[PDB]
Amino acid sequence: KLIDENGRRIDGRKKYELRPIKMEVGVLKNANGSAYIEWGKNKIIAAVYGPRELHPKHLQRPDRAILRVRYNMAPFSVEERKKPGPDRRSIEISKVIKGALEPALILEMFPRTAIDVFIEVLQADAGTRVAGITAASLALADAGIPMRDLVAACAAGKIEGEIVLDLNKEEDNYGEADVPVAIMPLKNDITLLQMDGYLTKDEFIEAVKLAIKGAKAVYQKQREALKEKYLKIAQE
Amino acid sequence: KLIDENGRRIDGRKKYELRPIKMEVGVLKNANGSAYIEWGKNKIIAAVYGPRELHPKHLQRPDRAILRVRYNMAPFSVEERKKPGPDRRSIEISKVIKGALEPALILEMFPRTAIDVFIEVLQADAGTRVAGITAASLALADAGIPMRDLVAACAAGKIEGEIVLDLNKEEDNYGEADVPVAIMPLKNDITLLQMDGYLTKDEFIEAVKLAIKGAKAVYQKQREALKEKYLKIAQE
Amino acid sequence: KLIDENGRRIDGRKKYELRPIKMEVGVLKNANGSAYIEWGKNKIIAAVYGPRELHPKHLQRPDRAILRVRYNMAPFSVEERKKPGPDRRSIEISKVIKGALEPALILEMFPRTAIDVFIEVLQADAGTRVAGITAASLALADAGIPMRDLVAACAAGKIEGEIVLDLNKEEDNYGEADVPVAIMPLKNDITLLQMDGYLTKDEFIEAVKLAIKGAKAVYQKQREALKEKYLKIAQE
Amino acid sequence: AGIMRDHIINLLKEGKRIDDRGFEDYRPIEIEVGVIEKAEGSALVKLGSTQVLVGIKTSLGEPFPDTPNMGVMTTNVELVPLASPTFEPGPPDERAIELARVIDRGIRESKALNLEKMVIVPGKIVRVVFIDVHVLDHDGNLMDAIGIAAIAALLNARVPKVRYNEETGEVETLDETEPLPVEKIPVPVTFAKIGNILVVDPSLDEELVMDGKITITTDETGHISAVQKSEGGAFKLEEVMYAVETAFKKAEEIRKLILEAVEKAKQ
Amino acid sequence: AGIMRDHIINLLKEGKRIDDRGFEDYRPIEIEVGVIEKAEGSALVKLGSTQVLVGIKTSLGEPFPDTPNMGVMTTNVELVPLASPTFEPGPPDERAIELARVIDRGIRESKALNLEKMVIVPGKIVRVVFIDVHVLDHDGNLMDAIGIAAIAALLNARVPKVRYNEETGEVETLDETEPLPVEKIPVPVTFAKIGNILVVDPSLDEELVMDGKITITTDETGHISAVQKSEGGAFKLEEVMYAVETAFKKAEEIRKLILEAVEKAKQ
Amino acid sequence: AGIMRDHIINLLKEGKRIDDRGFEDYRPIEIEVGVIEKAEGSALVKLGSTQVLVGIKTSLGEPFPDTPNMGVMTTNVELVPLASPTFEPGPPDERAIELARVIDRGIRESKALNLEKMVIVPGKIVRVVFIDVHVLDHDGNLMDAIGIAAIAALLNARVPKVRYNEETGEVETLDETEPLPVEKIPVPVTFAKIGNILVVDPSLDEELVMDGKITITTDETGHISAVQKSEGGAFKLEEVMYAVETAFKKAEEIRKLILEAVEKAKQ
Ligand SMILES: O=c1ccn([C@@H]2O[C@H](COP(=O)(O)OP(=O)(O)O)[C@@H](O)[C@H]2O)c(=O)[nH]1
Ligand SMILES: O=c1ccn([C@@H]2O[C@H](COP(=O)(O)OP(=O)(O)O)[C@@H](O)[C@H]2O)c(=O)[nH]1
Ligand SMILES: O=c1ccn([C@@H]2O[C@H](COP(=O)(O)OP(=O)(O)O)[C@@H](O)[C@H]2O)c(=O)[nH]1
Ligand SMILES: Nc1nc2c(ncn2[C@@H]2O[C@H](COP(=O)(O)O)[C@@H](O)[C@H]2O)c(=O)[nH]1
Ligand SMILES: Nc1nc2c(ncn2[C@@H]2O[C@H](COP(=O)(O)O)[C@@H](O)[C@H]2O)c(=O)[nH]1
Ligand SMILES: Nc1nc2c(ncn2[C@@H]2O[C@H](COP(=O)(O)O)[C@@H](O)[C@H]2O)c(=O)[nH]1
């Protein structure tokens, strides 16, 4: 009551429209690479260090860097103030973002090292994990880390009987399914795929196809954020 | 009201009868050794690893293996669902099971290593620590760890004014004393001895003597569990 | 209502009088150095170990010892039983006591080592951190650790409109400001300076000057505690 | 290890797997329900040598303020150090947390446990259901083993009949027991991608060499109630499509073994 | 590092600092208020390249038994690993705890947030104010950055008008919002002692070589509501005197930028 | 160390111990009660150079639902890093937890603190007793030092007279104080087995070489209320028998020093 009408959604988006997305790379001095993203009401910052000295050693891998990811929401990012510190949700998101970024990375290039991805959600409005993945790729590119592709991500979802792109909080709260997807778009390699909800097979596949188009759309934004950095560097 | 009458206990046992005990060795693929025990309503699994690489080093002992024990109850093992994770009781039981098993082990045989004993109580019904010790010895034997003896354990207790063998939950709950004892039976070496409750000296000594006979009874079960493994291996 | 009258405070002290202070050095067998202090209703014990083997290494500093401080209150030290373990207050006090003691220590004398300062408040009655610092210096001297000076500490405060020396619990509870100060008195080097409360500049400076005179007074007590140890050793 | 990736890859190129399973075969499955008889429900599931016990303990409690209208369900997976040299003592790690969450989402989102049929007094007193998963031996595919055992333990569950006394306001827990409102049977089916091949119910040896993993949980109604691509690697859309299809087929074969095990424990 | 202490010391002997600031200059300051629009108030403060975001989330809750007469305020500083290679994941460390406490004392002891004007039902229902400080980039002087952002977020704050219905006993949270009772503007000014020189707003490079640090928080009324000498080193009384004086002067320059930023976010 | 096992063993073969104690002697004992005067009760016990302080803080609280009929007692042992290079900062370790539990069992199971004489309103408001044990110097035999100090602190305890106002329902805490219902004096006596010899009150040096340890807690009535064989090693039945006998004898000698110390603090 009523998330689609007519056939406009609450903020005015058609079924297959994305929320306004802005992205900036190079927002932090300390981080090796960093990116900032406003995707809706999402405001997410992503930082990468380095490749660097893994501690502790016994973690090192002899042939490759490891990727460590930490997704965290600031207490003030959600409507109900969230007690600081991770929780089960943020730890599974870290895990799945890791599993999202790792296949883009050429980790055997930096043996015995860690590459550390931090994702801080400053404001949260559904889709933080896809937004985070997206800023994370850009922060990885920003860090000068060889990647086979960027990873772009985007969720699709089912609201009021209907498959839609890029759920907002409200629509995910009242929705019937949420399907984030991350891909490396050059090869259409799906590196994240989750489905929370209830869906038929053909509902689920359409959601995947759709969130991927959202992901390719996001990817164009990503490249444009890198272009804009490679123009900004080009002085002098 | 009334734990002994006449002179049958609630489940029908005479004062000096043990609860039905079944034991199997070799129940886990990953563990180096393992044993399973149904002692009453107890259902306890014990696993051993290895001797293995202690981490972290600074723990290693230059002349001997260390024994580490962890006794844990599954949330669903007790009548009131127990929050996962250890608690003071399970940590003192780990400590005292360790102190129970260690004198059976020839630890200077495996310097700089750890031998790790895990005891999981799947269902709990009084006497889990003696049951655990008993499965632990069998899992140690199962692991091929040289031992001077098995360690067998069993508790005796005071219910309705009377010294009895192998308290059940009910009888320990309403009882006046609980006295677990573990021994290495060949030499009658007492490796665990606890007394929770209130007892005169002669009440306490009789309890000890009795729980030891229960322990020698358990020990015969143990050997039989090993016999049955050394017959089961003997193919081909 | 009424912390000063006339112009006697609740326990009978004039504005610039200190609570009874007694100090003993060498109160522990295990500690490298130790001191005990009764400063009011404060009863605080301070222990030092050693310089010793830092673990873990990666903490070692190549040119100097590190100073680690731990200030802790026993559950039974405060009027409302305090749950064991540190809390934010005790952790900032550890931090600030560390920052208080460190400039007295010649840390490049013991590279790669830790010097560990423990402060246990056995009874608490305002001014535990200055009392602690004071016993800590004495425990450092007691440990044979080269120091450029003792560190003496003392707080001054504002109660009922007036700047006073060495607040008690009551007076700090109802007070308008509390200003602990620690100094190395030989050079008048201020190594701790905190102000909790609300004060004008000239109120704050007078508080500092005053707590320093209290600190020089405490310092004479300190030396006397060392004299008394260097007379006590002098047998035979 | 490492020497095994190659043997495994090469076997896979020849349509073979090291235990002679086909790409779509599960290992031998054993489900035994009601094995923890003090718990309200339980299930010991073996997927080959992988062994998980799931225990279901219910109490009565307050529902979440958000939802006065719904019982409580909470799922925890303990990866006990005894199950594996990789399982260490302490709070759940990210593996345990992802397993608990995906299994939970499976059941919660299919409403396989109907939380609405677990209200006693709206807003005040609901049935609270702990799904505690105790992994006893990790030999691969904990995801499916756990989901199978979670659901089968829920089906097994017999909780005390509770009644609101409208003359006293008392809540009377009765001796007589009753099933939990379990209305669906979600089953996770999980695939390991190795190279360009997906293989169902990966053993530990296949998990060590896999590129990535994807789990698809579906119920009898032909619905998906959880998907989780886990670990690294990447799947193709068509890989995912196949996996959803195959998962439905495997789920059904599994649900038959679950229900059979559930019914056996009533004989 | 180490090679830098010397360069820094030597520059300081010549009245210079490595970025050409004078001893009493702050780096360029940026304050932007109301940037987290879902929070009740927020402020992003940049002190050069140091960046802190502070978010203010309020709820209604019980006051502490000690104080039925007073709302609640609680301050937490997260030093997120992303802000710095020195920030590690986990509960606050002693740096985060000292920053949170000194900033809190600053505000609490000046009654800059009047907790008495935050009672709804005495002893029962008060306004609860979380000051959550999220450090996003540590490039020195987190103390001042955080205090500036804490206070500016408090000034920015617009919380839901709440009213006690004396006929129902209900507490009605209204759509309409209102400032927090923020009545002062404490500002920490912090000095690094390097050798015999104090320098205001130390950068990370100056923090690496400093002997010690002292922070002085003062408000518009000419009052000090916090002092904290932090780290090692020692100050002379006259160092402290100077710092209090200078701090008042710098605070005032800062409070002007804060209030300006606060007002900008209402345009 | 190691060189000491041998010296200790050899001395023991000659009926000697390194400080010239006999096998059944305690080190010099000092008990001083009421030393933390803000706590309800306290005791500083020295067993040679072992020093433990025990503080008893009571409040009023809810009894456990299981037991509306009984006050609360809870025992915690802090092994403060200052007491010993082996004591590290953090939550209790297994040594602290076993000491707290065995001392508690000692007192609880003898009903030395009668929890029934600590009800104020049945099911609702009971006396709550914290026995907080602060070990200040570990030089062996913490078990006995702690039990002696726990019991002596309980005997020392003077808690506020509380009364139920049956006209108001108020619970009035009165200025006037009263002993805790302490009705027995359990005393742990602890033996180190070294080789084939048991020696009472082991010092740290004897603890370093001991095979195992057994502690026997007994009261005035000739009852045992705790036994704990701790550490490794093994005892013979006759070792245990002897230890129980000897323990009763030593306990009695100790209880005299406790009661004497308790009475001294009333002069
Ligand atoms: O502690 C929390 C965690 C989640 N959320 C909200 O729930 C949304 C969607 O939930 P989901 O698990 O799908 O994560 P996301 O969509 O953000 O990736 C998040 O963006 C937040 O807006 C919240 O309010 N509080
Ligand atoms: O959290 C717990 C711990 C203990 N128990 C029960 O108390 C019994 C006996 O207590 P005891 O401390 O003597 O341990 P055990 O006899 O099992 O070795 C256990 O078997 C359990 O049945 C319980 O219900 N919940
Ligand atoms: O958990 C606590 C911590 C503090 N205090 C009391 O508050 C006093 C003064 O507070 P402050 O923060 O100024 O520390 P101190 O003056 O002791 O150095 C302490 O001595 C204690 O008496 C307390 O009762 N309980
Ligand atoms: N509403 C409600 N939630 C509970 C209750 N017991 C546990 N939970 C929830 O279920 C989870 C189980 O946590 P545990 O009780 O195992 O520590 C917790 O995260 C908690 O939020 C209860 O009685 N009522
Ligand atoms: N009285 C009261 N105190 C609270 C409330 N919420 C948080 N606090 C206090 O503020 C701090 C914030 O902790 P958090 O809620 O962030 O974990 C806690 O230490 C707690 O004491 C509340 O609703 N009422
Ligand atoms: N029933 C009841 N138990 C308490 C109370 N305070 C503490 N306890 C119990 O005593 C122990 C002491 O814990 P602490 O309060 O020291 O953290 C806890 O494990 C807790 O169960 C109380 O007020 N009422």
Side-chain angles (χ1 to χ4, degrees), chain E residues 200-217:
Chain E
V200 85
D201 184 31
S203 65
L204 216 205
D205 294 314
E206 277 163 343
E207 299 171 334
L208 297 160
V209 316
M210 68 180 175
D211 286 342
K213 198 159 215 187
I214 188 179
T215 286
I216 320 278
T217 306

Side-chain angles (χ1 to χ4, degrees), chain B residues 2-13:
Chain B
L2 270 192
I3 7 177
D4 291 347
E5 251 2 37
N6 191 332
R8 274 197 27 253
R9 297 195 263 163
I10 280 153
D11 56 3
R13 6 203 298 254

Side-chain angles (χ1 to χ4, degrees), chain B residues 14-199:
Chain B
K14 299 184 251 286
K15 275 183 290 219
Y16 320 117
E17 177 156 349
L18 298 164
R19 273 171 300 179
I21 316 179
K22 310 171 189 292
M23 42 197 87
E24 192 179 338
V25 149
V27 302
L28 303 168
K29 172 179 179 154
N30 286 274
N32 286 105
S34 68
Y36 170 68
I37 189 173
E38 288 182 7
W39 181 330
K41 332 232 231 295
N42 301 290
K43 297 165 145 62
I44 300 172
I45 186 147
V48 165
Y49 297 75
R52 51 181 191 183
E53 268 260 298
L54 231 187
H55 317 290
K57 261 144 190 6
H58 73 72
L59 293 160
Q60 320 208 327
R61 281 181 62 108
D63 57 322
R64 59 163 206 97
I66 67 181
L67 212 212
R68 296 187 291 187
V69 173
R70 191 245 223 193
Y71 168 97
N72 180 75
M73 323 208 277
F76 50 66
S77 57
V78 280
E79 209 205 335
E80 287 306 295
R81 191 253 177 194
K82 187 194 131 280
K83 159 143 218 43
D87 50 7
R88 320 225 330 153
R89 187 191 90 108
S90 63
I91 280 160
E92 178 214 354
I93 285 75
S94 292
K95 178 168 203 287
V96 100
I97 277 38
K98 177 188 174 311
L101 295 171
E102 183 181 292
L105 305 181
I106 309 108
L107 289 172
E108 342 78 66
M109 266 165 174
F110 307 102
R112 308 226 98 100
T113 66
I115 290 157
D116 297 329
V117 182
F118 298 108
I119 294 143
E120 299 283 340
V121 355
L122 303 187
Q123 186 169 87
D125 205 42
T128 64
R129 89 188 56 167
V130 303
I133 284 168
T134 291
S137 295
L138 289 164
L140 289 159
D142 193 33
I145 297 201
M147 295 172 77
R148 318 191 152 83
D149 209 344
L150 296 180
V151 177
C154 200
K158 179 167 156 230
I159 63 186
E160 266 149 32
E162 285 231 280
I163 305 294
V164 304
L165 190 59
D166 181 42
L167 298 210
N168 73 6
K169 188 184 136 211
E170 305 109 283
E171 295 173 350
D172 189 23
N173 290 3
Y174 301 106
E176 301 140 310
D178 187 23
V179 190
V181 178
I183 58 269
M184 294 187 279
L186 286 178
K187 254 110 146 282
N188 288 275
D189 274 327
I190 298 147
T191 72
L192 171 142
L193 211 212
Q194 298 187 282
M195 194 285 278
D196 197 355
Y198 203 66
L199 287 179

Side-chain angles (χ1 to χ4, degrees), chain E residues 10-22:
Chain E
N10 287 8
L11 269 185
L12 267 196
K13 268 64 179 292
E14 310 160 51
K16 313 185 85 166
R17 286 168 92 174
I18 42 184
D19 57 358
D20 308 317
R21 277 192 290 156

Side-chain angles (χ1 to χ4, degrees), chain D:
Chain D
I3 22 262
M4 229 61 91
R5 164 104 182 163
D6 283 323
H7 180 61
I8 294 182
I9 281 167
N10 287 8
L11 269 185
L12 267 196
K13 268 64 179 292
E14 310 160 51
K16 313 185 85 166
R17 286 168 92 174
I18 42 184
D19 57 358
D20 308 317
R21 277 192 290 156
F23 298 161
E24 287 171 4
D25 300 323
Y26 274 74
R27 279 161 300 177
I29 292 163
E30 272 185 48
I31 304 145
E32 204 191 329
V33 122
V35 288
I36 308 303
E37 63 267 12
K38 287 169 73 134
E40 286 62 73
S42 54
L44 177 66
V45 168
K46 310 193 196 172
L47 253 64
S49 276
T50 286
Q51 301 205 51
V52 345
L53 220 198
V54 165
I56 279 157
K57 282 234 104 114
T58 68
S59 70
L60 289 173
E62 303 204 303
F64 296 106
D66 22 316
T67 46
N69 58 300
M70 260 157 88
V72 183
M73 183 192 93
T74 174
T75 315
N76 180 250
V77 166
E78 297 304 314
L79 264 15
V80 304
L82 77 60
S84 174
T86 75
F87 289 171
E88 285 187 353
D93 73 323
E94 65 175 12
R95 311 168 290 187
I97 286 164
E98 167 196 51
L99 294 163
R101 291 175 47 81
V102 171
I103 289 316
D104 182 279
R105 285 197 298 267
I107 286 154
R108 165 176 328 263
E109 301 291 318
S110 56
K111 331 284 178 209
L113 215 219
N114 197 338
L115 299 189
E116 285 139 67
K117 307 191 170 176
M118 280 173 39
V119 186
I120 304 300
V121 183
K124 322 295 296 156
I125 299 179
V126 303
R127 189 81 73 169
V128 176
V129 179
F130 293 95
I131 305 178
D132 292 295
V133 172
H134 219 54
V135 165
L136 307 171
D137 216 359
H138 174 16
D139 200 25
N141 194 15
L142 284 187
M143 193 75 67
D144 301 12
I146 291 163
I148 285 155
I151 195 68
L154 286 170
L155 290 158
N156 180 243
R158 287 204 68 98
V159 303
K161 271 185 166 198
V162 156
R163 41 178 270 262
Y164 197 53
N165 189 316
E166 301 150 44
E167 316 190 301
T168 312
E170 220 82 275
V171 168
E172 318 163 70
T173 272
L174 318 168
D175 273 358
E176 192 199 340
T177 58
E178 60 175 18
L180 250 25
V182 187
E183 306 197 336
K184 273 159 199 127
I185 304 139
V187 170
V189 176
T190 285
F191 305 78
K193 187 165 165 173
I194 313 184
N196 284 323
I197 284 134
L198 312 212
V199 117
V200 85
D201 184 31
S203 65
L204 216 205
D205 294 314
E206 277 163 343
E207 299 171 334
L208 297 160
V209 316
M210 68 180 175
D211 286 342
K213 198 159 215 187
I214 188 179
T215 286
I216 320 278
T217 306
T218 61
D219 59 31
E220 316 84 276
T221 57
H223 295 268
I224 313 155
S225 56
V227 184
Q228 190 87 342
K229 182 290 186 136
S230 52
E231 314 314 314
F235 290 76
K236 258 39 178 75
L237 211 196
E238 32 297 304
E239 283 172 346
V240 159
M241 302 173 42
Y242 162 87
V244 165
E245 204 132 311
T246 310
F248 264 109
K249 194 168 64 164
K250 304 262 99 198
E252 201 30 35
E253 309 189 312
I254 303 254
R255 186 144 41 234
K256 284 184 198 319
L257 295 163
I258 291 170
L259 250 25
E260 193 176 292
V262 171
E263 283 291 296
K264 198 198 174 143
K266 307 166 177 179
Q267 269 69 95

Side-chain angles (χ1 to χ4, degrees), chain A residues 81 83-84, chain E residues 61-64 72 74 128 130:
Chain A
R81 191 253 177 194
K83 159 143 218 43
Chain E
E62 303 204 303
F64 296 106
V72 183
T74 174
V128 176
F130 293 95

Side-chain angles (χ1 to χ4, degrees), chain A residues 54-178:
Chain A
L54 231 187
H55 317 290
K57 261 144 190 6
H58 73 72
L59 293 160
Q60 320 208 327
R61 281 181 62 108
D63 57 322
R64 59 163 206 97
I66 67 181
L67 212 212
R68 296 187 291 187
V69 173
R70 191 245 223 193
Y71 168 97
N72 180 75
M73 323 208 277
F76 50 66
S77 57
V78 280
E79 209 205 335
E80 287 306 295
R81 191 253 177 194
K82 187 194 131 280
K83 159 143 218 43
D87 50 7
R88 320 225 330 153
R89 187 191 90 108
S90 63
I91 280 160
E92 178 214 354
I93 285 75
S94 292
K95 178 168 203 287
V96 100
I97 277 38
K98 177 188 174 311
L101 295 171
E102 183 181 292
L105 305 181
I106 309 108
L107 289 172
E108 342 78 66
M109 266 165 174
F110 307 102
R112 308 226 98 100
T113 66
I115 290 157
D116 297 329
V117 182
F118 298 108
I119 294 143
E120 299 283 340
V121 355
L122 303 187
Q123 186 169 87
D125 205 42
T128 64
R129 89 188 56 167
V130 303
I133 284 168
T134 291
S137 295
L138 289 164
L140 289 159
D142 193 33
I145 297 201
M147 295 172 77
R148 318 191 152 83
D149 209 344
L150 296 180
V151 177
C154 200
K158 179 167 156 230
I159 63 186
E160 266 149 32
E162 285 231 280
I163 305 294
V164 304
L165 190 59
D166 181 42
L167 298 210
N168 73 6
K169 188 184 136 211
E170 305 109 283
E171 295 173 350
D172 189 23
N173 290 3
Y174 301 106
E176 301 140 310
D178 187 23

